[PDB]
Design an enzyme around this catalytic site. Structure first.
Site, PDB file in Angstrom:
ATOM      1  N   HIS A   1      37.973  24.133  29.023  1.00 38.74           N
ATOM      2  CA  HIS A   1      38.652  23.430  30.104  1.00 38.74           C
ATOM      3  C   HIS A   1      37.842  22.172  30.427  1.00 38.74           C
ATOM      4  CE1 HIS A   1      41.857  23.741  33.207  1.00 38.74           C
ATOM      5  NE2 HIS A   1      41.133  22.764  33.724  1.00 38.74           N
TER       6      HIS A   1
ATOM      7  N   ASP B   1      44.474  30.999  30.889  1.00 39.74           N
ATOM      8  CA  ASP B   1      45.617  30.942  29.986  1.00 39.74           C
ATOM      9  C   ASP B   1      45.468  31.794  28.733  1.00 39.74           C
ATOM     10  OD1 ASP B   1      46.913  29.308  31.780  1.00 39.74           O
ATOM     11  OD2 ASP B   1      46.092  27.465  30.900  1.00 39.74           O
TER      12      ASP B   1
END
Ligand SMILES: NC(=O)C1=CN([C@@H]2O[C@H](COP(=O)(O)OP(=O)(O)OC[C@H]3O[C@@H](n4cnc5c(N)ncnc54)[C@H](O)[C@@H]3O)[C@@H](O)[C@H]2O)C=CC1
Ligand SMILES: NC(=O)C1=CN([C@@H]2O[C@H](COP(=O)(O)OP(=O)(O)OC[C@H]3O[C@@H](n4cnc5c(N)ncnc54)[C@H](O)[C@@H]3O)[C@@H](O)[C@H]2O)C=CC1
Ligand SMILES: NC(=O)C1=CN([C@@H]2O[C@H](COP(=O)(O)OP(=O)(O)OC[C@H]3O[C@@H](n4cnc5c(N)ncnc54)[C@H](O)[C@@H]3O)[C@@H](O)[C@H]2O)C=CC1
Lengths: 426, 426, 142
Positions: free
Chosen positions: B305, B362
């Site tokens: 991320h 996710d």
């Protein structure tokens, strides 16, 4: 590079910042290095901030100047044509005969849209605003053209772009036909970009439609004059959505919605209807329709301008074009003489003089389209349609730039960390 | 404020700019008036420019902190539910039992979409990607819901918010049903938000559907964990579209496409294909996409991320729920235990530790989804469905600031004015 | 011999030969070609069938679909024990197969269906139904 040496900032420590200049317009102070030094600015609106480098369109609102690739708008409006102007915005140079032929042939060959998309129009209500249907179809394109969505592929960008330039006008005329109950008209290759659009807008199977070369040039001119307008609300939207990886079609769709934006703004909405109806050379003239301004909604009727100080450079050729069209369509223009009435008030009324609600480029495009029998709701559709090439250019330049996908800062002022203890029992 | 005392901008005279402080995070430099005096900063990539001031969500990257109206995401995902979180994000405080029941009632009684809006589905190709259909449908809602397009009319904004919040699950479910050729399921006013979605996703008229409680809760958490994520790309698209005045549905449709965007590369879903495509410990992972991965093809499968430094605070509860789901299921987990190997690879492969490609929410979200029988072609549709409440909160905030229009300045580095001459013809 | 027919005759005459056992006189041929040409257009309700198929389907599969659906629309000539039925059915097939074929194609590429034209030969008409669009006049290369 006179005193453009460079400036410095400091609060507890100093910092160096270069002074970048443009080929036109004011200087800018590069702060692309302050982010790392731990320094951030606060500009809710991007008024004091310059977010991009462009070579597409140049504007100087105070001097009423508009150039597309250095070429002045007035010349292009009279000397070139939409496609050549399109070619210029996307390629940065005027076309050779060969390059132009190839360009025009590529566009002309893909004007017809997949029959399954056409089936989409028929699921919309007949009573819907054609601008709304326009945003619907354009936002639906990615489901049918999933073959050219990757902007990181130059071949995709190429195909997508052309699909848009070719198909937008086809989609636009279908939104119109659909709204009046007449059958859709297929593109014809033997017709120019503008002549083909008028035919798709007006012809029926009942008789052969013949485009008036005068009205055709006027439509061609309405387009050129709306191809691009530098940085603005809708072009920023196209750029912002674009840098997130959003596909080109979706980008053009958000641009179309951003353009329509101010229209359904309540205060504007209410007023626009006041013009599009009150006009019996009783009201409008005796400033009866103008004895009611609690809300301005002027630029939405074609008065005043956000950028240009005293006049809309684009409005010079549109007015003369406007004059030519009216004289061509003969003088059965009773009501449309409020056009002459309003222009007089916009220039001579102390109020309009002081607040500068001068006729802009739309004041005259509006008069031309009306003169042609095009409903008021199809105005922004045609402007968005023409503005598409300009949106592609900005999008192409945005990606083909450096795709500096920005992850913006926010100055937070909400609550500090606090514990949650629901008051409900579901 | 530490090094945030007083700052002076120096050119050839001193310009004292003040330092603003946030309740959390960094203090910024006020530069709202610089441009107001000719001086323009230049900052593409927005490395220093603070797009706006917000009170909705706070994220501390290096500290792995995420707050919604002050509450830690961990606290909300564990002891809250999606609707209650929707209320907080939208209203700014947790509701009372009375405010919650009032808000919930309204959300449930607007979940059915107009029948005509349901016709439009049948016009898309049966092989259309669920996400492209989701964008197409959303971008078409304005054509129907014309009574709630005034971005300035508070009543219109409320209705638009409830409409999007109520119908998004209904439409996402239909996108799934249409893609697999199963009949559409209507909302169940007696089921919960997440349960109703599960019902609309997998129920059939052939037999009644049982909403597993563990799956029901897993989904609701996925919704919570994706409710909002501060000033990211898709949200910048929403704020910028809304700035122009674009209607509620157009801005959300822009968000969806923007959220889908970073997934169009032929190297993206291509590498994201080999992933789920295999249920065999030694296939997807040993010695495979060591470099077989292309564009991101790491960062696309739920790894790493760009906001969080060490980890994703949202993955905590998500990883917990994953266990509960694979545990509970049994039948749809065990043969899918190539996840633990993928996770293990991420926690020890020199390449993954070197790229900080740690597992994010996710990754765990996909597992729960792949376990529940949801195809990867629905993952981002579901993430978007949840994020809509966030887009709605930011769109509203941007409005409350005074519909902060986004029409920034550019640095023009193109052609200085040059005469236009076309020796060709069309 | 096939080589001669391939160079000396034409599809319809060859068709006439396969079904009648003899080459046609001018008159018999004229009548034959006129009967075929007059029934090339298919009932508009059948056309509505093509649109219930998926766009992504193989055109051969759609072809088997429409042809197997014909009996529901042409229930007026199904009794093979009737020489008049065999006659009508046969011609319906010879005339309509190419029309159906080009519709399977158009349908697969998203272009509009093209109606048969009587002024075109059996083959020239097929190329036109396969390739022309309303955007420009298509000219078959002899
Ligand atoms: N610059 C380039 O190289 C471009 C190539 N293409 C390619 O063309 C093919 C079809 O793309 P689309 O136009 O999006 O098809 P689309 O899916 O909208 O379907 C339209 C169909 O009608 C045809 N068509 C459209 N306008 C026509 C006209 N005026 N005259 C004759 N035929 C016409 C198209 O070729 C296509 O067969 C694709 O392979 C696409 O990649 C499309 C645009 C630009
Ligand atoms: N906060 C509020 O008070 C809101 C009021 N509205 C109003 O309601 C009307 C539009 O409602 P929409 O749902 O957008 O209509 P719609 O155009 O989406 O069509 C759905 C129809 O079925 C009804 N319906 C929807 N979900 C239902 C459910 N779960 N159970 C039973 N009936 C259901 C709707 O009321 C409407 O009659 C307008 O008057 C609009 O202003 C809409 C949203 C919020
Ligand atoms: N050899 C014979 O005596 C034949 C007689 N027929 C008869 O013709 C009538 C219609 O049969 P179908 O063709 O199966 O109709 P069908 O149900 O497919 O409908 C097609 C309609 O379009 C007309 N049509 C087709 N192609 C045409 C063309 N190129 N020019 C002008 N009109 C055209 C047909 O006559 C009919 O009216 C029936 O009475 C059928 O029995 C059909 C084939 C052969």
């Amino acid at each position: 590079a006179d005193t453009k040496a460079k400036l410095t900032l400091d609060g507890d420590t100093a910092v160096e910042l270069d002074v970048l200049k443009g080929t036109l317009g004011q200087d800018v102070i590069d702060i692309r290095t302050l982010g790392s030094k731990g320094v951030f600015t606060f500009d809710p609106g991007f008024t004091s901030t310059t977010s991009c480098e462009s070579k597409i369109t140049f504007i100087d609102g105070d001097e009423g100047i508009l150039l597309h690739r250095g070429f002045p708008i007035d010349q292009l409006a009279t000397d070139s044509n939409y496609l050549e102007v399109c070619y210029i915005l996307l390629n940065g140079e005027k076309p050779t005969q060969e390059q132009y032929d190839e360009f025009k042939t590529t566009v002309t060959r893909h004007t017809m849209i997949h029959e399954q998309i056409t089936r989409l129009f028929h699921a919309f209500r007949r009573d819907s605003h054609p601008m709304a249907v326009m945003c619907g179809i354009t936002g639906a394109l990615a489901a049918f053209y999933h073959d050219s969505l990757d902007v990181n592929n130059p071949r995709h960008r190429e195909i997508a772009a052309f699909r848009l330039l070719s198909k937008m006008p086809t989609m636009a005329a279908m939104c119109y036909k659909y709204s009046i109950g007449q059958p859709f008209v297929y593109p014809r290759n033997d017709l120019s970009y503008a002549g083909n659009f008028l035919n798709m807008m007006f012809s029926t199977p009942c008789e052969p439609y013949e485009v008036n070369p005068i009205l055709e040039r006027a439509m061609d001119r309405i387009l050129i004059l709306h191809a691009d307008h530098e940085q603005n609300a809708s072009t920023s939207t196209v750029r912002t959505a674009g840098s997130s990886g959003a596909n080109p079609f979706a980008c053009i769709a958000a641009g179309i919605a951003s353009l329509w934006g101010p229209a359904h703004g309540g205060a504007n909405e209410a007023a626009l209807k006041m013009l599009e109806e009150i006009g019996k050379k009783e009201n409008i003239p005796e400033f009866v329709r103008r004895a009611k301004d609690k809300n301005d909604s002027f630029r939405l009727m074609g008065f005043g301008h956000r950028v240009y100080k005293n006049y809309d450079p684009r409005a010079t050729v549109m007015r003369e074009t406007c004059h030519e069209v009216l004289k061509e369509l003969g003088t059965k223009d009773d009501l449309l003489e409020v056009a002459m009435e309003l222009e007089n008030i916009a220039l001579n009324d102390p109020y309009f003089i002081e607040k500068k609600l001068y006729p802009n480029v739309d004041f005259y495009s509006g008069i031309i389209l009306k003169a042609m029998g095009i409903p008021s709701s199809m105005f922004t559709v045609i402007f968005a349609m023409a503005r598409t090439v300009g949106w592609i250019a900005h999008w192409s330049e945005m990606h083909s730039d450096g795709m500096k996908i920005a992850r913006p800062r926010q100055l937070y002022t909400g609550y500090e960390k606090r514990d949650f203890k629901s008051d409900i029992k579901r």
